[PDB]
Design a protein around this ligand. Structure first.
Ligand code: MG
Ligand code: MG
Ligand code: MG
Ligand code: MG
Ligand code: MN
Ligand code: MN
Ligand code: MN
Ligand code: MN
Ligand code: MN
Ligand code: MN
Ligand code: MN
Ligand code: MN
Ligand code: NA
Ligand code: NA
Ligand code: NA
Ligand code: NA
Ligand code: NA
Ligand code: NA
Ligand code: NA
Ligand code: NA
Lengths: 387, 387, 387, 387
C-alpha cells in the first residue's frame, strides 16, 4: 500500500541520502555514496528524480576532464533508471572562502567568484534538464550587528540576482530561480529569513517573473511559523516554484527529519493545501537520515518520506470528499470567506445601513464558529478513526 | 541628563500607560485613566504626542453627542500641552464580534462592519492631524487548519485594504497606512506574521505607495527574528512609515516591556540604524507598565522608554564617530560591502579571469574578518567602557 | 467508537469548559456557566470527574452562608451524576493582591494570606474526597532581575510547602500535593519553570513523600522540551501524582488546546508511556475551548479531548503488541538498554579487556541503530496505515 | 582598564580557542592549535587556567608513549606560564561509536567502554590537579520516541554515575562531578535537558554529595529559560560546582558566543548573582570564536570574554553599593522577601486574624511594587548613565 508512482514526482537531493553524518559535535558515521549508487537506489524506491549542488556531483577543484567523467557517469545512471533532474543549486556555503557569504560577502572579490561559480552550474543544470535553480544563501548574514550593513547587503543580493537574470535571459534559457529562506544556522541570523522576506525581496528585482521561492518545512518552523500558511501566501503570489519537504520539532537547529516526522498535523495541512491548489512541481525531500543509521536505515528513511506524503494525501482527500466535512465547512462559513466583501463597491458599502447603523453586533457575536467540530473531523480523518 | 525634547518625537499610545493590568490570568490592578490625564502626564515627561484606537478615545457604542464631548475634551488637552496625534488605529480585536477577525472574518457581514468602523475612524484621525493610520490584524488567523483558507483570507485582506485606499484617495486625504505584523497571539497563528510577509502583501495592493509597515520590536522577536535586520529591509523597500518600540525576552507571549528592556543589544543596533538612516517618523512606544506597578510606576516606566532611547542614541553616535571604530569597519570591509559587485557589467564579469580561473580561493579564505574586535568596540561603546 | 468509560478516569477543571473567552486582547465571548451545568454536561459526555479552584466554586469574598449554598448545589450535582472530585487547587493568581505572588510575594502579609486561603480550601478538598491538591504558582516570578531574589523566594516557597505539609499531617489527611511547573506567563519568568526544577525542589522539602508534580503538556512545550521525556523522569522518581493534558503549538503563549491538538506525535508517545507504565491517576484536561466557539463547540471540544486519548491508546497498544514492532525493538537494542551496564561490579568492569583494550570501536560504530524503520512502524500504527 | 588578574580565576577549554570552525554546513577555517600554543597565548591575556576533554589533549587512539609525550609537553607549558587545570571532562560524543550515547547507549558494550574511557581520564585529571570532572551527555537522547526508553536510560545513567562515584571513593580522590545539562543538539532531545532535571537526578544517586551541576549560559537559553534564576536554584541547593560562560541569542542552535554577547542584561544579572553569592569556582568560558575570524580574532574574542565579565562585575557592584538602589530595594520589599513568612509557626498563623479575617486585600492590592524604578536604576548602572 502507499506505493510511489512517477506522477507523484518525488525527488531527493544527492546530499540527503548521501549525508555522511558529520554534525557540530561528531564525525561522519557513513561512508560517502557515489551519486550513481544513490540514483539507482532511489529509483528502486519509486523516486522520480534527484537534485544536486555543483559540489555534490563534481568534487570542488576538479579538472575539466574530471568534471566530464563525473557528469558522464551520472547521466548514464539517469538514463539507466529513467530518473530526472528537475532542480539544481550552487554550494556557496561549505568552502571556507564563503565564511562571510557568497553574494553578500563583504569582500567584493568573493562576491564576483560566487557569481561565476553559480553561472557555471546554471549551464550544467540546463544541460541536465533542470527547470528550477535554487539559491540557499546560508552564509548571508551575521553573528554581530556591526559586521553586516543589511541595506548594503540587500543591494548586493539584488545586484547578484539581477545579473543571474540577465545571464539566463541572454542565453535564452527557460530555467527560473527559487530563493530558499532560512532564519538562522549557520549564521547567527540569515538574510531573507522567511518566505515573506524572500517574496518581498523578489518584488524589487529587475525581472521579478524569473524568481520565486523554495520554502522548506523545517526552516519556517525554526521561526515558529505556520508552514501551510506561508505556502498559501506563496501560492497566492504565484511564486511557489519548488518546495523542500522534511520534518522539524519546533525552534531548534535544523533537524531535516524525514517528511511526516516533526509536526505531523502541519504535514497533513500542507499536503491538503498542495493537492487542493494543484501544485504541479516536484515533491522534493531535503532531509537527513539520522547519523544513528546504516545504509539500510538511509533507504528506509527515504522510503518513509514518500510513504508519509502518500498516506497524508489519502487522508486529506477523504477529508475534503466527506459530505459531513463539507457540511461542517459550510457551518463554519468557509464558503463565505471565499466571497467578496464588497463587490457592490465602496459607495454602496458606505451607504449600506446593514453594515453599520443596523448591524446587530451582539447577534453576530453570539454565533459560534463551530471550528472545534470541524477540526475533530480533520483529526478523525487523519487518524482513520471516523465512527 | 538624557532629557527628551520635541525633536525627539517620542509618542505613546493611550492604551500603553492606560493599560489597567488585566492579563490571561488576572484582573485589572489599576483604575482606568482619563485620556486627558495621560496627555498631561506624558507632556510633563517630555513626550511629543499620543496615538489612539477609536475605542480608547470614544467608548464603544457612544452616541454622537458623547463622541463629540470625548473628542472635545481630548483636543483641549492636546491644545493645553502642545501634544500631537501623529497616528491612529482601529480596535478590530476586543469586541466579541471580531473573534474570528475583522477584515478576514469568515462572516461577510462582520467584514463589512469592520471596514465601516475603520472608515469612521480614518475621518477622525485626519481631523486630529494624523499622518499614519495603523492596522494591527490581531484577530486575523486561526487556531486550526480547516478554519481559515489563507488564500481566500489574503483575497479578503487585499480587498479591504484596496477599499480603504480608494476611500482616502476619494476624500483627498494625505494619510497613509502602516500594517503591523505579529506572528501569533491572540490567534494561534496570525496572517502576515512578520515584516517580510507584510511587505510582500503590500506589493500586491492596487495602490502600493499608500501602504507601509509598522513593525514592533517584540513581535519580530516572538518569531526569534532579528528586529534591526527586518527594519533594514523595510527601510531598503522605502516602507518604514512608523515603528513600535518596546522590549521582549525572546519567544514568549507578547510582553510589551519598556523600550531598552528585553534584548538590550538589539535595542542598541536598532537605534544605531534608525539614526544612521535618518528615520524621520515618530519614536512610538507600544508598551505596558507591568501590572505590579502603581501610577508612579506607570510614569517611571514611560520615562524609562525615552531615557533608554536617548542613552542608546548617544552611545551609537559615539561608536560611529570613533576613529578607531571607523578603522575597524574598514578592517572588516564594510566599505567594500557598500560598493557594487559588478558595475563593469555581466560580460566583463564573465570575461574576468580574476573572478574565476585566477581567483586564489585559499588566500581569500585565509583573511580574517576581524568582526570580534569590531563587536567588542561596539560593546565598549554601549557600556561606556572605552579604555 | 472510542466511547469514554468510568475506568478511563477522564476529568476536567471547572475553569476549562467554563472559560468565558477573555484573552489579553479581547472580552468574554461566552456567559458564565453554573458549575452544576458543567458537571451534568461533562457526565453526559462520559467524564469521570471534575476539579476546581476555590474561586471557581465559591465566588471570592462569599459569606459563610453563600459558601455553604454553593457547595451544597455542587454536591447535589455530583450525587445526581456519579461524578467525582479527585483534585482541587487554590486560585493564587487572579486577584490583584497576588500580583507579585502568593507564597513568594515580596510582602510578607500577602504570603501569610495566601497560606490561609490555601489551608481553607484544603479542608474543602478533603470534604469533597480529593486525593491530590495542586499548586500552580503562576504569579511566582518576575519581569526584571532586581525584583525577586530567587534564593530568598525559594526559601519562602519551601517554608510555605513545609507549613502545608505540617498542616495535613496534623489533621490526619491523606491528601498529597502536586506542584505544577510553567516556564513563563503571566510572569516574565516563573519560579520552578519545568518538571525538573519542581522535582529538584521537592527533594529539599521536610516531608518529600507528600509532594509530587502535576506536569502540563503545553507548559513543558513552552520551553521546547519533550513532554514524554519529562513524564518519564517524573515516573522514574515516583512523583507523577497527577497530570494535565492539552495541546500546544510550540514556543508561544499557553494555548491550552484540546488534547491531541498541537503536537500529535508527542501525544501518541505520552499515551504510550502512561499506559505502559500503568499510571493510575486521573486523565485530567486543563484546556480551553477557543473563544470562537459557542456552547455546542465547548462540549465538542471536551468530547474531543477524550476521543483523542482513546484513539491514541488504541494505536499505542497495537504498536506495542505487533510482533513486527517487537522484532524492530530488539533490532534497535531496546532490550539491551533495560539491562544493567555492569551488574558484575566496578572491579570486574575495570578488569574486563572486552570493555577497553579489546573493544573493537570501529565494528561497534558500524552497527546501525535501525531507529528509522522502528519510527516508521510507529507512524504507520498511529495513522492506521499498516500494509 | 578591566585587566584580568589571577584571583579572577578565568579559565578556557582547549576546544574553545582551539575550535577550527567546522559547522553543520562548512569546513574548518582555521588550522589546529597545539595545546601548548593555547596555554601560552591565554596566559598572556591574563587567564588563570585551561580545561580539556581527553581527546583534546591526547589524540584518540594514541599509544602509551604518545600519550606520555602529549601530557609532558602540556605540563611544561603549564609550568612555564603558571596556568592551572581546574576541570577536565571526557569526549563521549565525537567518535561514531557514541552515536546513540555513551552511558545510555542502547548497546551495553558501548556503555561499558564509555565508563572505561571516563575512568582513564579521571586518573589523568587528578594527576593534573583538577577539582571538578564535568560530564556533558551530548549524545544521550533521541530523535524518535521508540528509540530510547527514558526510564531505562535514567537507570543506566544512574548506574554509570554511581560506578564513577564508587571509583573516586575507592581511590581516595577529592575530585567531584558536575553534570552539564543541554536541551537538544546534537540529539533531537537530550536527557537531563535543564539545570532542574540534572539537580533532580543527582538527588537519586547513591552518593549525592559527590555531584553537582555545570550549567552553561547558552544551554538554558536554548530552552528560553532564565539563566540567573537557574543558577540561583543551583546555589540554593548547594550544587553550583562549576559554570560555563558564553552568549546565546535565544532559541537556536548552540551558538557559544563570547561571554557578554547574546543576552547582555542576563549576563549582568548573572555576574551580580555570582559575586553577591560569593561563588568561588572558576569563571570558565565555553565559547567559540566565530569561524569568520583568524587567530588574531580568536585571541580578541577570548580577551573579550574576560573584559565583559569585569565590566559587568564593576557595574553590578556599583548598583548594589548605591544608596539610592538600596532605598529602591527597600521600597520594593526585597528585605521582606528575605524574612520568614511564619517563624511564629503554623498554629500562630492559623490563629492570626491579620492573615485572613482582618486582612485588607484591597489595601494590599493597591500598593505598587516600584519594580520599574528599580529596574531603570539597574539599567542606568549597567550603561554607566547615572544622572
Ligand atoms: Mg476556493
Ligand atoms: Mg552607506
Ligand atoms: Mg521494561
Ligand atoms: Mg540575603
Ligand atoms: Mn534544513
Ligand atoms: Mn532545503
Ligand atoms: Mn506587542
Ligand atoms: Mn504595536
Ligand atoms: Mn496551560
Ligand atoms: Mn494546568
Ligand atoms: Mn554550548
Ligand atoms: Mn559547556
Ligand atoms: Na549599497
Ligand atoms: Na505558485
Ligand atoms: Na477568495
Ligand atoms: Na522607509
Ligand atoms: Na531567605
Ligand atoms: Na509516579
Ligand atoms: Na532499566
Ligand atoms: Na553551590
Amino acid at each position: 500500500n502507499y506505493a510511489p508512482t512517477p506522477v507523484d514526482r518525488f525527488t531527493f537531493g544527492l546530499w540527503t541520502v548521501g549525508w555522511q553524518g558529520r554534525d557540530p559535535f561528531g564525525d561522519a558515521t557513513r561512508r560517502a555514496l557515489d551519486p550513481v549508487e544513490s540514483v539507482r537506489r532511489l529509483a528502486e524506491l519509486g523516486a522520480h528524480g534527484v537534485t544536486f549542488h555543483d559540489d555534490d556531483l563534481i568534487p570542488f577543484g576538479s579538472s575539466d576532464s574530471e568534471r566530464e567523467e563525473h557528469v558522464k557517469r551520472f547521466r548514464q545512471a539517469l538514463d539507466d533508471t529513467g530518473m530526472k533532474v528537475p532542480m539544481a543549486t550552487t554550494n556557496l556555503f561549505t568552502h571556507p572562502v564563503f565564511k562571510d557569504g557568497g553574494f553578500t560577502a563583504n569582500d567584493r572579490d568573493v562576491r564576483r567568484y560566487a557569481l561565476r561559480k553559480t553561472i557555471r552550474n546554471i549551464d550544467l543544470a540546463v544541460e541536465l534538464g533542470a527547470e528550477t535553480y535554487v539559491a540557499w544563501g546560508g552564509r548571508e548574514g551575521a553573528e554581530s550587528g556591526g559586521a553586516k550593513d543589511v541595506r548594503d547587503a540587500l543591494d548586493r543580493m539584488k545586484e547578484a540576482f539581477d545579473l543571474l537574470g540577465e545571464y539566463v535571459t541572454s542565453q535564452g534559457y527557460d530555467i527560473r530561480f527559487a530563493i530558499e529562506p532560512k532564519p538562522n544556522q549557520p549564521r547567527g541570523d540569515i538574510l531573507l529569513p522567511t518566505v515573506g522576506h524572500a517574496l518581498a525581496f523578489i518584488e524589487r528585482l529587475e525581472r521579478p517573473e524569473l524568481y520565486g521561492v523554495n520554502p522548506e518545512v523545517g526552516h519556517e518552523q525554526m521561526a515558529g511559523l505556520n508552514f501551510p500558511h506561508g505556502i498559501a501566501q506563496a501560492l497566492w503570489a504565484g511564486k511557489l516554484f519548488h518546495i523542500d519537504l522534511n520534518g522539524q520539532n519546533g525552534i531548534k537547529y535544523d533537524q531535516d527529519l524525514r517528511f511526516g516526522a516533526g509536526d505531523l498535523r502541519a504535514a497533513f495541512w500542507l499536503v491538503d493545501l498542495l493537492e487542493s491548489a494543484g501544485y504541479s512541481g516536484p515533491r522534493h525531500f531535503d532531509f537527513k537520515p539520522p547519523r544513528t543509521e546504516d545504509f539500510d536505515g538511509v533507504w528506509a528513511s527515504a522510503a518513509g518520506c514518500m510513504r508519509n506524503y502518500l498516506i497524508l494525501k489519502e487522508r486529506a482527500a477523504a477529508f475534503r470528499a466527506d459530505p459531513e466535512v463539507q457540511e461542517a465547512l459550510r457551518a463554519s462559513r468557509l464558503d463565505e470567506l471565499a466571497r467578496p466583501t464588497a463587490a457592490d463597491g465602496l459607495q454602496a458599502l458606505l451607504d449600506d445601513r446593514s453594515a453599520f447603523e443596523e448591524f446587530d453586533v451582539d447577534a453576530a457575536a453570539a454565533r459560534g464558529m463551530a471550528f472545534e467540530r470541524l477540526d475533530q473531523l480533520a483529526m478523525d480523518h487523519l487518524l482513520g478513526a471516523r465512527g
